């Protein structure tokens, strides 16, 4: 498991970030899910869409200007909030006109305990 | 043939009336992956801003050169950072470190509570082993013995490795001052029953330690019989061991021998 | 080229306007929907964002669209890249909405033909916290002299590490500030060391009593080091001589259970700041 | 990076509806057509890229525009629009590993259509949204191996509340003996004018929603099949531009309409290969030849004295039931629900009361 395993305490704003390997291709989609299926939030440039039961009050999006890094900060951490977070990059190539997309998924273990 | 309209005059806010120069008490204290904001920067000065801040990377926040500095590293060297608890950050200049900003000095910050994450247990162990031990720092360095709340795979491994590595030295010869601070902290630092150095090497020590570092606690056979005689005249440190400070007392011998009210 | 430069004001909003731009050819005649700005934005266009209908032409100062926000309200909004804007050079600040027959392809064709259209990007302001960019102000509002116009990262009752370095020296200058004690309550190593040094130099003040009260259950080492250093310089002190470096006999004895039977001092503890951990916690059960 | 053709596709789909009691959601139809591009490939991909004016390079920035528009639509608590999407693929279908690694969290679900093919789909849709009885037992068969569902919910509290007072109206034109519909009257300042589409007068007024950049545009005139045929995004923008503020004494009915519509033809002319089993090249999803049989739209709209509640469901299934096609009514008015910033059109149709 080369992915980092970050640990924090309850109430501390945990910051989880990803850097896309392919910086040349236009970023169409940033995504943050919790395994196995639930989707936490969706990001397109500066705009953010919330799925399931999630709002800006609970989990924020403090990377609106930077595209090379996607970052989520979770405030008021809870043992329920502790889990494995999947962070997804969807690029398309704007150089030519093709149908192939680029997908980059990175996992990160967020462990919260007293 | 053209309806012209001059744009309204621009009122500049605080978000644009800045320069990274003369902003150093805001850039230096920061955390990882946080966008602390500096004013617009020209393309020529950016390199300088990059050189002064190696842990920071310039990110093009907005138009007109509006950029922020994102911290992705903590380049804190052990012989400078953990040697002094005061230094949250230091500055290099002409090959010398300092605690005050200067023109051209390169910033180097430190991990938060770096002694709580165990980055320095390797270097601090080999620095103040003797002849340079500081009663301030290397005594507070053992505050982590019960304050390590890292709860991380690397951190716990570092803590256990440090425990064993220093237990080797405290087994060879207790007279090391760092080991003295260790047995000072060992009263309740790790739960209440995690101390057994009594029977490993401290069970059989040199005869000089009988007369120099454990006087009435580790006695000879005749003194062993005399110690328990009467009603605790040699139990705890009444007779002559009271003059000797309570530095190296066996933990089992501590509660047992030293319990005089 | 352009023959019909007709304008059409918006009955719904004076800002939104139309241009019935007719040209030399019947192919090039367009009802371009362009909207200027005359409002002053004391509110939010979208939650957390302000998007004035002004959009800077490439090669213009960022100040022009910072005016449309009241200076009091614009103390928190940072300008970033927005969606690309097409404008009218003759009337700068124009925002050409793409609709119906007019398209960015046609916009690019018109730009190539003549200089009536200028590129740029929409002014996108996002609300972050206040911005602290002057060395005096970071020293000011972390010390709580002016609890205004600075980010909560420096104004969270010292819940973070963003103003520990300066206030180490600030508290070295004067430990009497209650905000200094509030910062010390944050339980941070720089505060630990600076207060240990201050107490070692000056334990006589009451600033050390609350410090040792705060730190003792968690960290022993800083308090013990300060107590050891302070007594060395002032050995004959009327209160230091209990259970410390200057006892009656040679060396420094009575460090541990020997303090349990002590009655002349360390019974009605006037100030537990003169004693280490062993001299108090074990003392209570003795 | 535009969605003008995206909305124009739904507008065209609404135009071809030949009915008098119409309640249609262009946004749902456009969403289905636009987001069926992910499993599309080859001929069907170019057909779906031609129906909405989106070149191959512009694919992906258009998705940023769509998601940003969805976020902007969900920016308030008094009014909000929810958009949900689900897909169901037969277990005998072996979807591509890359497609599953990419879009399996965006509503993909696996089940065989031979056993209990409807109740599970209904439960899933009711879990992920607020629509129930969306799928009936006659809508899926053993042949079917693929199902698609899209759902739109709009709730908007009026910016200017409609005072509740006793008023009713009656109609006597035809098709009914006597029918009474509740009415109300409010005096308030609103933006409404008298514009001509093509030498035809029309009174059009905009009703806003509280804490929302959404509006409901009402047009009243004599021959409004002409008005329906003359609907574009540009025309609606022009009408909003021209309609200006004045004091109005507006009388409106508290109408509630339900609609079910077959979209097969009107979603079929521009995408012939999406329904033909011999040309449906959906290779980004699976290698096997999978095609789409039929599609159906269910719409509900309620206009009250406090706000509007609208629901829509677009379904891609095998077959379904039919709906009446001849419900004639006189003196109606056209309503259009439009977000001013994004330019999306969510619901439009006609009424029967006035
Ligand atoms: C989308 O529509 C939304 C409709 O609510 C807009 O968001 C809201 O917009 C208002 C202003 O239109 C924001 O500002 C508040 O508005 C009033 C100010 O009006 C009062 O004072 C003026 C005189 O100054 C007077 O004429 C009025 O009658 C009122 O007495 C006050 O409530 C507040 O002080 C505040 O300024 C709202 O904050 C805002 N709501 C939010 C953000 O939730 C939004 O602008 C529209 N988007 C557009 C047009 O792009
Ligand atoms: C409401 O208005 C529509 C459309 O408006 C009509 O068409 C314009 C181009 C002008 O001619 C307007 O004056 C006119 O109102 C009416 O539908 C249209 O009706 C006309 C007249 O019957 C139809 O024209 C016929 O069409 C075919 C050939 O295309 C032949 O039968 C005839 O030669 C004749 O040209 C026209 O097709 C039709 N358009 C449709 C159905 O989309 C509509 O009747 C009117 N309603 C009422 C109640 O008057
Ligand atoms: C991440 O990107 C790097 C940099 O492009 C990739 O490393 C190169 O990948 C190419 C792929 O054609 C290889 O030809 C090179 O030999 C690679 N170089 C090195 C130094 O490894 C890398 O493969 C990408 N992916 C990952 C998972 O790291
Ligand atoms: C994309 O198209 C460009 C056109 O210049 C071409 O140079 C490049 O090789 C293409 N890339 C791929 C992966 O086909």
Q: How many helices (H) and strands (E) does chain A have?
A: 0, 8
Coil, strand or helix at B27: coil
Looking at chain D from residue 200 to 219, which residues have their Cβ under 8 Å from any Cβ of chain C?
A: 206
The residues, any chain, with a CB within 8 Å of residue B199's CB and separated by 6 or more, are: none
| Dihedrals phi, psi of C56, to nearest 5 degrees | -65, 135
Nearest Cα to D308, choosing from D239, D207, D191, D231? Answer: D207
What are the residues facing D335 on neighbouring strands? D218, D349
- Measured torsion, CA atoms of residues D138, D140, D143, D149, in degrees rounded to the nearest 10: 150
Question: What value does the CA radius of gyration of chain A take, rounded to a whole number of Å?
Answer: 15
| Residue among D73, D157, D213, D342 whose CB has most ligand 1 atoms within 8 A, to mutate | D213
Coil, strand or helix at D300: strand
**List of chain B residues whose C-beta atoms are within 8 Å of the C-beta of residue A12:** none
B167 and B222 together in one domain:
no
Cβ within 8 Å, pair D206-C16: no
Cβ–Cβ contacts within 10 Å for residue C61, how many?
Answer: 15
Nearest Cα to D26, choosing from D39, D16, D40, D41? Answer: D16
**List of chain C residues whose C-beta atoms are within 8 Å of the C-beta of residue B139:** 221, 224-225
- Ligand 1 nearest-atom number relative to CA D211: 5
Q: Please tell me if the CB atom of residue C45 comes closer than 6 angstroms to any atom of ligand 1.
A: yes
Handedness of CA C218, C219, C220, C224 (dihedral sign): negative
The answer to whether C245 touches C252, Cβ cutoff 8 Å, is yes
**Centre of ligand 4 from the C-alpha of residue C218, in Å:** 62
For C53, nearest residue in chain D (alpha carbons)? D341
Q: How many helices (H) and strands (E) does chain B have?
A: 12, 6
What are the residues facing B98 on neighbouring strands? B91
Task: Return the residue matching tokens 């010398």.
Answer: B96
State the distance between the two ends of chain D, measured CA to CA, in whole angstroms.
Answer: 41
The answer to whether D32 touches D150, Cβ cutoff 8 Å, is yes
Cβ within 8 Å, pair D71-A99: no
Looking at chain D from residue 111 to 150, which residues have their Cβ under 8 Å from any Cβ of chain A?
A: none
Establish, for the pair of chains A and B, how many residue pairs have beta carbons separated by less than 8 Å.
Answer: 28
Residues A11, A32: Cα–Cα separation, whole Å = 20
Task: Report strand pairing: C55-57 vs C117-122.
Answer: antiparallel
Which residue has a Cα nearest atom 19 of ligand 2? D226
The half-sphere exposure of C39 on its side-chain side, counting CA atoms within 13 A, is: 16
Looking at chain B from residue 155 to 174, which residues have their Cβ under 8 Å from any Cβ of chain C?
A: none
Exposed/middle/buried for residue B219 (C-beta within 10 Å: 0-12, 13-18, 19+)? middle
In this structure, what DSSP letter does residue D139 have? G
B156 occurs within a structural domain:
yes
Task: Return the residue matching tokens 């052990």.
Answer: B78
- Ligand 2 nearest-atom number relative to CA D223: 1
**List of chain D residues whose C-beta atoms are within 8 Å of the C-beta of residue C47:** 75-76
**List of chain C residues whose C-beta atoms are within 8 Å of the C-beta of residue A56:** 48
The residues, any chain, with a CB within 8 Å of residue C244's CB and separated by 6 or more, are: C227, C228, C231, C252, C274, C275
Can you read off the two tokens belonging to residue A64? 């609106």
**List of chain A residues whose C-beta atoms are within 8 Å of the C-beta of residue D48:** none
Q: Which ligand is nearest to the CA of A89?
A: 3
Residues D253, D258: Cα–Cα separation, whole Å = 16
Residues C138, C165: Cα–Cα separation, whole Å = 11
- Measured torsion, CA atoms of residues C158, C161, C162, C168, in degrees rounded to the nearest 10: 80
The answer to whether D232 touches D8, Cβ cutoff 8 Å, is yes
The half-sphere exposure of B179 on its side-chain side, counting CA atoms within 13 A, is: 20
Can you read off the two tokens belonging to residue D46? 């170019």
**H-run or E-run covering A6:** strand A5-8
Residues D93, D147: Cα–Cα separation, whole Å = 12
The answer to whether D299 touches D259, Cβ cutoff 8 Å, is yes
| Residue among A96, A99, A102 whose CB has most ligand 4 atoms within 8 A, to mutate | A96
The residues, any chain, with a CB within 8 Å of residue B179's CB and separated by 6 or more, are: B166, B169, B170, B173
The answer to whether D332 touches D223, Cβ cutoff 8 Å, is no
**Centre of ligand 2 from the C-alpha of residue D21, in Å:** 20
The answer to whether C53 touches C15, Cβ cutoff 8 Å, is yes
Nearest Cα to D150, choosing from D331, D281, D289, D25? Answer: D25
Handedness of CA C266, C271, C277, C280 (dihedral sign): positive
**List of chain C residues whose C-beta atoms are within 8 Å of the C-beta of residue A65:** 80-81, 126
B159 occurs within a structural domain:
yes
What are the residues facing C32 on neighbouring strands? C19
The answer to whether C191 touches C166, Cβ cutoff 8 Å, is no
The answer to whether D218 touches D227, Cβ cutoff 8 Å, is no
The answer to whether C143 touches C170, Cβ cutoff 8 Å, is yes
Residues B88, B72: Cα–Cα separation, whole Å = 17
The half-sphere exposure of C93 on its side-chain side, counting CA atoms within 13 A, is: 27
Q: Which ligand is nearest to the CA of D330?
A: 2
Our CA angle for C51, C54, C58, nearest 5°, is 110
In this structure, what DSSP letter does residue D95 have? B
What are the residues facing C22 on neighbouring strands? C4, C29
Residue at which a domain ends, from B195, B219, B242: B195
Cβ within 8 Å, pair C71-B28: no
Task: Return the residue matching tokens 């007293």.
Answer: A114
Own/partner pairs, A78-81, CB within 8 angstroms, 24+ separation: A78/A10, A78/A112, A79/A10, A79/A112, A79/A113, A81/A110, A81/A112
What are the residues facing B210 on neighbouring strands? none
SS3 content of chain B, % helix, strand, coil (to 5): 35, 10, 55
Nearest Cα to B73, choosing from B92, B46, B93, B53? Answer: B53
How long is chain C? 286
Which residue has a Cα nearest atom 6 of ligand 4? A96
Q: Which ligand is nearest to the CA of C43?
A: 1
Question: Residue A71 sits in which domain range?
Answer: 5-112
Span D4-157+257-317: which CATH code?
3.30.497.10
Exposed/middle/buried for residue B168 (C-beta within 10 Å: 0-12, 13-18, 19+)? exposed
The half-sphere exposure of D212 on its side-chain side, counting CA atoms within 13 A, is: 27
The residues, any chain, with a CB within 8 Å of residue D196's CB and separated by 6 or more, are: D202
B122 and B181 together in one domain:
yes
Residues A107, A85: Cα–Cα separation, whole Å = 6
Residues A30, A27: Cα–Cα separation, whole Å = 8
The residues, any chain, with a CB within 8 Å of residue B117's CB and separated by 6 or more, are: B111, B150, B152, B155
Which residue has a Cα nearest atom 49 of ligand 1? C45
Looking at the 3D structure of chain B, how many domains does it have?
Answer: 2
Coil, strand or helix at D161: coil
Task: Return the residue matching tokens 């004690």.
Answer: C181
**Centre of ligand 3 from the C-alpha of residue B81, in Å:** 36
- The CA distance from C28 to the nearest CA of chain D, in Å, is 17
C54 and C170 together in one domain:
no
What are the residues facing D34 on neighbouring strands? none
The residues, any chain, with a CB within 8 Å of residue C282's CB and separated by 6 or more, are: C256, C257, C259, C260
| Dihedrals phi, psi of C167, to nearest 5 degrees | -75, -10
Can you read off the two tokens belonging to residue D92? 């005998």
Cβ–Cβ contacts within 10 Å for residue C256, how many?
Answer: 22
In this structure, what DSSP letter does residue C30 have? E
Task: State whether residue A97 sits within 8 Å of chain D by CB.
Answer: yes
List pocket residues of ligand 2, CB cut-off 6 Å: D 223, 225-226, 229
For chains B and D, tell me whether 3 or more CB atom pairs sit within 8 A of each other. Answer: no
Nearest Cα to D65, choosing from D4, D106, D12? Answer: D4
The answer to whether D316 touches D32, Cβ cutoff 8 Å, is yes
Looking at the 3D structure of chain A, how many domains does it have?
Answer: 1
Q: Where in chain D is the domain with CATH 2.30.39.10?
A: 168-253+329-350
Task: Return the residue matching tokens 């690397």.
Answer: B154
- The CA distance from C81 to the nearest CA of chain A, in Å, is 8
B219 and B177 together in one domain:
no
Our CA angle for C89, B15, B4, nearest 5°, is 15
Instruction: Return the beta strands (E) in A37-112 as ranges.
Output: 39-44, 47-50, 69-74, 83-92, 101-112
b/e C111-125 (16+ beta carbons within 10 angstroms → b):
beeeebbbbbbbbbb
The answer to whether D10 touches D344, Cβ cutoff 8 Å, is no
In this structure, what DSSP letter does residue C53 have? S
Can you read off the two tokens belonging to residue C34? 């362009």
C8 and C100 together in one domain:
yes
Can you read off the two tokens belonging to residue C65? 């669209």
Question: What value does the CA radius of gyration of chain C take, rounded to a whole number of Å?
Answer: 34
The half-sphere exposure of A95 on its side-chain side, counting CA atoms within 13 A, is: 5
Task: Return the residue matching tokens 């990110």.
Answer: B59
C122 and C181 together in one domain:
no
In CATH, what number is assigned to the domain containing residue A9?
A: 2.60.40.10
Distance of CA C130 to CAs B13, B34, D229, Å?
Answer: 11, 14, 52
Residues D340, D214: Cα–Cα separation, whole Å = 6
**Centre of ligand 2 from the C-alpha of residue D228, in Å:** 13
Q: Please tell me if the CB atom of residue D200 comes closer than 6 angstroms to any atom of ligand 1.
A: no
Residues D134, D28: Cα–Cα separation, whole Å = 14
Measure CB to CB from residue C47 to each of D2, D75, D242 and give the nearest one: D75
Residues C10, C18: Cα–Cα separation, whole Å = 8
Cβ within 8 Å, pair B63-C81: yes
B189 and B120 together in one domain:
yes
**Centre of ligand 4 from the C-alpha of residue C102, in Å:** 30
Instruction: Return the beta strands (E) in chain B as ranges.
Output: 36-40, 56-59, 66-71, 89-93, 96-98, 106-109
> Which three-class secondary structure string do you get for D167-208?
CEEEECCCCCCCEEEEEEEEEEEEEEEEEECCCCEEEEEEEE
Distance of CA C196 to CAs B177, C184, C202, C252, D69, Å?
Answer: 20, 11, 10, 21, 57
Question: Residue C267 sits in which domain range?
Answer: 157-285
Residues D153, D125: Cα–Cα separation, whole Å = 13
Question: Residue B148 sits in which domain range?
Answer: 116-195
Task: Report strand pairing: B106-109 vs D294-303.
Answer: unpaired
The answer to whether A83 touches A35, Cβ cutoff 8 Å, is yes
Name the packing angle between helices D26-35 and D4-15 (round to 10°): 120
Instruction: Return the beta strands (E) in chain D as ranges.
Output: 23-24, 80-89, 108-110, 146-157, 168-171, 179-196, 201-208, 214-220, 245-253, 256-262, 294-303, 307-317, 333-339, 345-350
How long is chain B? 261
Handedness of CA C235, C238, C240, C245 (dihedral sign): positive
b/e D75-108 (16+ beta carbons within 10 angstroms → b):
bbeebebebbbbbbbbeeeebeeebeebbebebb
Residues B243, B215: Cα–Cα separation, whole Å = 10
How long is chain D? 354
Name the packing angle between helices D26-35 and D43-51 (round to 10°): 150
Please tell me the class of the D168-253+329-350 domain. Answer: mainly beta
**List of chain C residues whose C-beta atoms are within 8 Å of the C-beta of residue B3:** 5, 7, 90-91
Nearest Cα to D41, choosing from D287, D266, D315? Answer: D287
Instruction: Return the beta strands (E) in chain C as ranges.
Output: 4-9, 16-22, 29-35, 49-50, 55-57, 77-80, 84-88, 96-97, 117-122, 124-127
Q: Please tell me if the CB atom of residue D268 comes closer than 6 angstroms to any atom of ligand 1.
A: no
Cβ–Cβ contacts within 10 Å for residue B192, how many?
Answer: 8
| Furthest C-alpha separation in chain D | 64
Question: What value does the CA radius of gyration of chain B take, rounded to a whole number of Å?
Answer: 29
The answer to whether A94 touches D58, Cβ cutoff 8 Å, is no
Residues C156, C197: Cα–Cα separation, whole Å = 25
**Partners of chain B (3+ Cβ pairs below 8 A):** A, C
**Centre of ligand 4 from the C-alpha of residue A24, in Å:** 13
Residues D102, D165: Cα–Cα separation, whole Å = 55
Coil, strand or helix at D302: strand
- Ligand 4 nearest-atom number relative to CA A98: 14
- The CA distance from A3 to the nearest CA of chain B, in Å, is 13
The residues, any chain, with a CB within 8 Å of residue B16's CB and separated by 6 or more, are: B39, B40, B64, B66, C62, C63, C66, C79
Q: Please tell me if the CB atom of residue C90 comes closer than 6 angstroms to any atom of ligand 1.
A: no
Cβ–Cβ contacts within 10 Å for residue B33, how many?
Answer: 17
C136 occurs within a structural domain:
no
Measure CB to CB from residue B24 to each of C90, C135, C250 and give the nearest one: C135
Cβ within 8 Å, pair A101-D56: no
Name the packing angle between helices C164-173 and C135-142 (round to 10°): 70
SS3 content of chain A, % helix, strand, coil (to 5): 0, 50, 50
Looking at the 3D structure of chain C, how many domains does it have?
Answer: 2
Residues B202, D158: Cα–Cα separation, whole Å = 84
Cis amide linkage into residue D58, ω under 30° from 0? no
The residues, any chain, with a CB within 8 Å of residue B191's CB and separated by 6 or more, are: none
Residues B89, B82: Cα–Cα separation, whole Å = 11
Residues D96, B109: Cα–Cα separation, whole Å = 48
């Amino acid at each position: 498991t080369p992915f980092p395993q970050t640990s924090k305490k309850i109430g501390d704003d945990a910051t989880l970030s990803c850097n896309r390997n392919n910086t040349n291709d236009y970023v169409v989609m940033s995504a943050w899910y919790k395994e196995p299926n639930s989707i936490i939030l969706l990001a397109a440039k500066s705009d953010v869409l919330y799925f399931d039961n999630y709002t800006k009050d609970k989990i924020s999006y403090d990377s609106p200007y930077d595209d090379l890094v996607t970052t989520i900060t979770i405030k008021s951490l809870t043992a329920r909030d502790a889990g494995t977070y999947v962070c997804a990059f969807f690029m398309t190539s704007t150089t030519n006109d093709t149908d192939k997309v680029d997908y980059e998924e990175y996992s990160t273990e967020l462990i919260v305990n007293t | 043939e053209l309806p012209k309209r001059d744009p309204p005059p621009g009122v500049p806010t605080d978000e644009m009336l800045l320069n990274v120069d003369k902003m150093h008490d805001v850039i230096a204290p920061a955390k990882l992956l946080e966008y602390v904001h500096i004013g617009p920067l020209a393309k020529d000065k950016e390199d300088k801003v990059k050189k002064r801040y190696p842990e920071f990377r310039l990110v093009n926040t907005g138009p007109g050169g509006l950029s922020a500095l994102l911290r992705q590293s903590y380049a804190g060297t052990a012989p400078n950072c953990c040697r002094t608890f005061q230094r949250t950050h230091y500055w290099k200049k002409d090959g010398k470190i300092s605690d005050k900003y200067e023109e051209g000095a390169v910033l180097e910050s430190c991990w938060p509570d770096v002694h709580d994450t165990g980055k320095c247990d390797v270097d601090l162990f080999d620095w103040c082993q003797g002849d340079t031990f500081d009663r301030n720092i290397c005594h507070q360095w053992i505050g982590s013995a019960f304050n390590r709340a890292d709860r991380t795979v690397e951190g716990q491994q570092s803590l256990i490795n440090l425990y064993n590595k220093m237990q080797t030295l405290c087994s060879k010869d207790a007279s090391v001052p760092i080991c003295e601070s260790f047995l000072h902290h060992l009263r309740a630092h790790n739960t209440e029953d995690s101390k057994e150095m009594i029977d490993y090497i401290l069970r059989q020590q040199s005869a000089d330690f009988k007369q120099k570092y454990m006087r009435c606690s580790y006695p000879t056979r005749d003194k062993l019989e005399e110690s328990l005689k009467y009603a605790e005249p040699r139990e705890c440190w009444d007779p002559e061991c009271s003059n000797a400070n309570v530095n190296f007392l066996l933990t089992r011998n501590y509660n047992n021998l030293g319990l005089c009210n | 080229t352009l023959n019909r430069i007709k304008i059409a004001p918006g009955i719904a909003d004076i800002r939104d306007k139309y241009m019935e731009l007719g040209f030399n050819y019947p192919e090039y005649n367009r009802a371009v929907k362009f909207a200027e700005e005359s409002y002053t934005y004391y509110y939010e266009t979208s939650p957390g964002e302000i998007k004035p209908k002004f959009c800077l032409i490439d090669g213009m100062s960022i100040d022009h669209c910072s005016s449309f926000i009241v200076p009091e309200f614009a103390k928190q909004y940072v300008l970033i890249h927005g969606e690309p804007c097409s404008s009218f050079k003759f009337r700068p600040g124009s925002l050409i909405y793409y609709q119906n027959e007019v398209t960015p392809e046609y916009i690019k064709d018109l730009k190539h033909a003549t200089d009536y259209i200028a590129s740029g990007q929409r002014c996108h302001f996002i609300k972050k916290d206040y911005l602290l960019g002057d060395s005096d102000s970071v020293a000011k509002c972390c010390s709580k002299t002016n609890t205004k116009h600075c980010p909560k990262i420096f104004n969270n009752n010292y819940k973070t590490e963003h103003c520990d370095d300066f206030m180490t020296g600030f508290c070295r200058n004067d430990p009497g500030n209650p905000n200094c004690l509030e910062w010390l309550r944050a339980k941070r190593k720089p505060a630990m060391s600076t207060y240990s040094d201050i107490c070692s130099k000056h334990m006589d003040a009451r600033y050390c009593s609350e410090f040792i009260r705060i730190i003792r259950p968690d960290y022993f080492t800083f308090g013990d080091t300060a107590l050891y250093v302070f007594c060395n310089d002032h050995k004959g002190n009327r209160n230091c001589w209990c259970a410390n470096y200057p006892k009656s006999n040679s060396g420094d004895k009575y460090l541990g259970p020997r303090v349990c039977w002590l009655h002349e001092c360390t019974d009605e503890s006037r100030d537990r700041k003169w004693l280490y951990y062993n001299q108090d916690v074990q003392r209570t059960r003795c | 990076y535009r969605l003008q053709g995206f909305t124009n596709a739904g507008i065209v789909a609404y135009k071809n509806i030949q009915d008098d009691n119409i309640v249609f959601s262009p946004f749902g139809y456009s969403f289905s057509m636009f987001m069926s591009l992910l499993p599309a490939s080859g001929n069907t991909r170019i057909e779906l890229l031609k129906t909405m004016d989106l070149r191959k390079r512009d694919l992906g920035p258009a998705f940023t525009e769509l998601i940003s528009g969805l976020a902007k639509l969900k920016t308030s608590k008094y009014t909000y629009t929810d958009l949900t999407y689900q897909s169901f693929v037969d277990n005998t279908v072996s979807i591509k590993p890359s497609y599953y690694q990419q879009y399996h969290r965006f509503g993909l679900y696996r089940l065989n259509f031979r056993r209990d093919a409807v109740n599970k789909i209904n439960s899933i849709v009711e879990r992920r949204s607020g629509m129930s009885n969306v799928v009936d037992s006659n809508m899926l068969d053993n042949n079917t191996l693929w199902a698609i569902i899209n759902t739109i919910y709009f709730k908007g509290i009026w910016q200017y509340p409609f005072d509740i007072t006793k008023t009713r109206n009656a109609s006597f034109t035809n098709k009914y003996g006597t029918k009474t519909v509740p009415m109300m009257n409010v005096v308030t300042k609103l933006q409404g004018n008298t514009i001509t589409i093509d030498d035809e007068e029309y009174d059009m007024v905009r009703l806003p929603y509280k804490d929302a950049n959404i509006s409901m545009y009402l047009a009243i005139g004599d021959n409004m099949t002409h008005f329906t045929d003359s609907i574009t995004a540009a025309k609606l923008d022009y009408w909003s531009f021209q309609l200006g503020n004045k004091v109005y004494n507006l009388k409106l009915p508290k109408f509630s309409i339900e609609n079910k519509r077959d979209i097969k033809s009107i979603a079929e002319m521009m995408a012939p290969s999406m329904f033909n089993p011999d040309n449906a090249s959906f290779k980004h999803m699976t290698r096997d030849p999978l095609y789409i049989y039929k599609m159906f739209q269910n719409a509900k709209i309620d206009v009250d004295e406090q706000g509007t509640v609208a629901e829509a469901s677009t379904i891609m299934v095998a077959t379904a039931r039919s709906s009446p096609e001849k419900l004639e009514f006189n003196t109606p008015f056209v309503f259009i629900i439009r977000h001013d910033i994004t330019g999306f059109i969510l619901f439009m149709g006609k009424v029967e009361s006035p």
